[PDB]
Structure 1
Amino acid sequence: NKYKRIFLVVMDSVGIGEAPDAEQFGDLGSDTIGHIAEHMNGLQMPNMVKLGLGNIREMKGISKVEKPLGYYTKMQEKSTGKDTMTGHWEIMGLYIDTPFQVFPEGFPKELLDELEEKTGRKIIGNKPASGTEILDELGQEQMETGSLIVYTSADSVLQIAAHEEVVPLDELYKICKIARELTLDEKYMVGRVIARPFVGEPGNFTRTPNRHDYALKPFGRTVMNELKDSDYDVIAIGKISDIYDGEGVTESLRTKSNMDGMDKLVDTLNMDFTGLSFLNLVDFDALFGHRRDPQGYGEALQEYDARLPEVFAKLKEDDLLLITADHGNDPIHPGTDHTREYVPLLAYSPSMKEGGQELPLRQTFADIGATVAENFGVKMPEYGTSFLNEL
């Protein structure tokens, strides 16, 4: 193996400017890092700069350097959708024709009608909402009527809330499995069905730890599957395991924040493994992009950058570090949805003694999977062109 360990970091939703097909998605003008850099009056990201972020594209506070630490370029998304599953599935060697849907106006009547017909229960709510808002609004009616609170977020999810003392857990889970079958339909294609059980009384409702998720498996066997099948380590950090429904994962580390995510990356740097360490830093997307909060997003980016020098210090000669994103989510953009953007790509190993150079633009996110697969000598994915030999 050219590299004994590869650390792949997805900075979730950290896009680097509208893609060539951005207009199809109503994403003209979108620019995640660039708009944040403008809002911050110059983003402070000196370590990403040293890696060559500005060499990809110069933005306010983010300048090109003469001798970047590693190689740099950006990636274009080939799959139809701009959702998380699509992006991560593509990263790991797939092509996804059928996009996952989001529901800012609630779910179609046809879907809810069939869910009622199959469960024998009424559905109330049907809108984007946080767990707190929806329970305070409809938790009491739920208790009194035995109906299901169906809701969504800004992402591709269908959430079903029911009081544990009115609707038994096992019944909620069966109901969610029914919902999961019905949403395997391109008209209503949801990334994840989530059981949201809760307890308490009006004005004092709390969601319980008895949450269960029903995800779809990736539409094909991934590079992670092949690594795992060839006895390599695949260490998933944060929401990575969930995103792939555990496929190809040998170990999973749960995280609570971006800083916690970097702590777990550091933990894996301290592990004697051979294979892939795969982190998702989700806060950018969940807390800032979807909430159209450029200030929070800017701060989170700076907090993330400040953690990087410790990572640089722990990388060995036969380690490779990959930093990318899975789509854009421009916090100065209409609506609550993601943005169709190029993603940055930085590829760094301390073995790169004279620094890096520009890579050709990656025409699919699967170039990452392909590079990973070639490095470890496993079956190459159907999609993607490895840049391993360029490094």
Structure 2
Amino acid sequence: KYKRIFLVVMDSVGIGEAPDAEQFGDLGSDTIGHIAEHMNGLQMPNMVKLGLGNIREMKGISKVEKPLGYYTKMQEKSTGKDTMTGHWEIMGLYIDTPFQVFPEGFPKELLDELEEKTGRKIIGNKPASGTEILDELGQEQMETGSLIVYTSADSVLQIAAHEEVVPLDELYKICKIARELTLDEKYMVGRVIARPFVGEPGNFTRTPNRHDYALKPFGRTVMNELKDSDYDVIAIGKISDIYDGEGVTESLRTKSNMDGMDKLVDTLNMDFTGLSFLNLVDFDALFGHRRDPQGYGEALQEYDARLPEVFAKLKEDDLLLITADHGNDPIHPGTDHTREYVPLLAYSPSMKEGGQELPLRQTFADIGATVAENFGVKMPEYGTSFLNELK
């Protein structure tokens, strides 16, 4: 049916609280809706043309009589609302065990065991930017040989040490220890990150010697199946990292949302057969977690303005899928993601009559099931394809 599928995850761009939002303390959450209200009307005319307002009408986002493609929202079935859970579900899995975040730092039980296994004390133990934590604790780390352990708003455990105090190979081994300790549901972290730095007090800089220790998806994904069947799987942005490279044939790293759209355009220009899969992370990383609705709105408007060029490049046998992985409502309390429905837009220029409303997707895995059916690869255990509906 389709030679190429272009899948775009607008990271954290949720479309209103899910039925189980209360389980997470996420009642009232509405990412796009609250941004629209803050912007006094979001300017997203191209998403509107695709049918975004037909899913839900929000300030500045109204329904259209003839949407370019098909539209609906998706409900998350997996236990957690983190990025890995969302993406793993999108590609055909079901994840019972959520990844955890640590707004007050890591539990004493974990750090005590890390201290025992490394013969070093742990300092910091809080959310912080790389720069902030080095300014505060970099000197102490140097003087003592303690390990700086910190986190972000996401499911990460970061370990900073001066390269002349803890040599790279030693820091990597420490991170591997930390990775094994954090394969535990009491404190399951998405990735352990080595954060080596150099310099002197008041002038510390992190080195390009960072290493990541991620968990692989809890199952063979639709990406695995595509790769194993000799299809192209082109990962753009954080996609390769999120899946620990599983099922990825080529990875295109990006530096911003606009760079991600440039790479999407690059893949439109490529002759491939299979999947081009983009994550636009700025929404989540720069605006959602920082609870910055203005910046979030601006980012959404910048993204929307790039879309007509994508529309112009799509072929008759190309499918464009636009969705999200969870919410991250920039006016919600705290710094965590929000449990929300995610929008789904499915567009191909071969839809000569435009689109219609699809039935609500009961799991994100419906995307994976649709991709798998299209390319004739092994169907995921979870998910219901909407491929036949796109006609």
Q: Same fold (TM over 0.5)?
A: yes
- TM-score normalised by length of structure 1: 1.00
Local SS of the residue matching 2:102 = coil
Q: Give per-residue Cα distances to partners, 1:33-55, cap 9 Å, x unaligned.
A: 00000000000000000000000
Q: CA deviation at 1:281?
A: 0.1
Query: After the TM superposition, which residues 233-382 of structure 1 pair with which residues of structure 2 at under 5 Å, given as runs?
Result: 233-382=232-381
Local SS of the residue matching 2:275 = strand
Q: CA deviation at 1:56?
A: 0.1
- TM-score normalised by length of structure 2: 1.00
Q: CA deviation at 1:384?
A: 0.1
Q: Distance in 1 between matches of 2:202 and 2:119?
A: 28
Q: Distance in 2 between matches of 1:231 and 1:24?
A: 41
Q: CA deviation at 1:325?
A: 0.1
Q: Give per-residue Cα distances to partners, 1:200-225, cap 9 Å, x unaligned.
A: 11111111100000000000000000
Give the unaligned 5+ runs of structure 1. none
**Paired residue for 1:16?**
15
Local SS of the residue matching 1:312 = helix
Q: CA deviation at 1:119?
A: 0.8
Local SS of the residue matching 1:306 = helix
Q: Distance in 2 between matches of 1:204 and 1:332?
A: 35
**Paired residue for 1:40?**
39
Q: CA deviation at 1:301?
A: 0.1
Q: Give per-residue Cα distances to partners, 1:159-203, cap 9 Å, x unaligned.
A: 000001111000000000000000000001000000000011111
Q: Distance in 2 between matches of 1:200 and 1:295?
A: 36
Local SS of the residue matching 2:180 = helix
Q: Distance in 2 between matches of 1:18 and 1:165?
A: 49
**Paired residue for 1:94?**
93
Identity score, percent: 100
Q: Give per-residue Cα distances to partners, 1:42-72, cap 9 Å, x unaligned.
A: 0000000000000000000000000000000
Q: Distance in 2 between matches of 1:200 and 1:22?
A: 46
Q: CA deviation at 1:87?
A: 0.1
Q: CA deviation at 1:376?
A: 0.1
Q: Give per-residue Cα distances to partners, 1:79-102, cap 9 Å, x unaligned.
A: 000000000000000000000000
RMSD: 0.3
Q: Distance in 1 between matches of 2:262 and 2:163?
A: 35
Q: Distance in 2 between matches of 1:39 and 1:201?
A: 44
Local SS of the residue matching 1:385 = coil
Give the unaligned 5+ runs of structure 2. none
**Paired residue for 2:145?**
146
Moved over 2 A (4+): none
Local SS of the residue matching 1:190 = coil
Q: CA deviation at 1:249?
A: 0.0
Q: CA deviation at 1:29?
A: 0.1
Q: CA deviation at 1:153?
A: 0.4
Q: Give per-residue Cα distances to partners, 1:321-365, cap 9 Å, x unaligned.
A: 000000000001100000000000000000000000000000000
379-388 or 199-208: which moved more? 199-208
Local SS of the residue matching 1:187 = helix
199-208 or 74-83: which moved more? 199-208
Local SS of the residue matching 1:179 = helix
Q: Distance in 2 between matches of 1:7 and 1:194?
A: 30
Q: Distance in 2 between matches of 1:32 and 1:51?
A: 19
Q: Distance in 1 between matches of 2:379 and 2:306?
A: 33
